[PDB]
Swiss-Prot record:
Swiss-Prot/TrEMBL keywords: Cell cycle, Cell division, Endosome, Membrane, Transport
Main location, first listed in the record: membrane
GO cellular component, one term: late endosome membrane
Protein name as annotated: MIT domain-containing protein 1
Oligomer and partners: Homodimer. Interacts (via MIT domain) with CHMP1A, CHMP1B, CHMP2A and IST1.
Record has Kinase as a keyword: no
GO molecular function: identical protein binding; phosphatidylinositol binding; protein domain specific binding
Organism: Mus musculus
Protein task: Required for efficient abscission at the end of cytokinesis, together with components of the ESCRT-III complex.
Residues of the full protein shown: 8 to 87 of 249
Source organism phylogeny: Eukaryota, Metazoa, Chordata, Craniata, Vertebrata
GO biological process assignments: midbody abscission
MIT domain residues: 8-86
Gene: Mitd1
Compartments (UniProt record): Late endosome membrane; Midbody; Membrane
Length: 93
């Protein structure tokens, strides 16, 4: 190929991007964003893996998905609590 961000497009691709972006957000402390992103990819990968006979790819994939699921969770689990933690509104929330 050639060093240049122009091409590269596919199904799982979107996941690669979404996933990538997620990481960033995660590093930006924007878990609320890195979460969905992470989920957006996982969901995408899931379908990818589902359609992956490769005994290897599956490993990697399954390793990526899950690897992106744990984080997402930890986040969500932290987001759900961070939500109510808000302790700021008209009444409850």
């Amino acid at each position: 190929g050639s060093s240049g961000s122009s091409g590269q497009d596919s199904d799982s691709t979107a996941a690669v991007a979404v996933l990538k972006r997620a990481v960033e957000l995660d590093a930006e402390s924007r878990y609320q964003q890195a979460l969905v992103c992470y989920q957006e990819g996982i969901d995408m990968l899931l379908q990818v893996l589902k359609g992956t006979k490769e005994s290897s790819k599956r490993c990697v994939l399954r390793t990526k998905i899950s690897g992106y699921m744990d984080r997402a969770e930890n986040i969500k689990k932290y987001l759900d609590q961070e939500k109510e933690d808000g302790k700021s509104g008209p009444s409850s929330g």
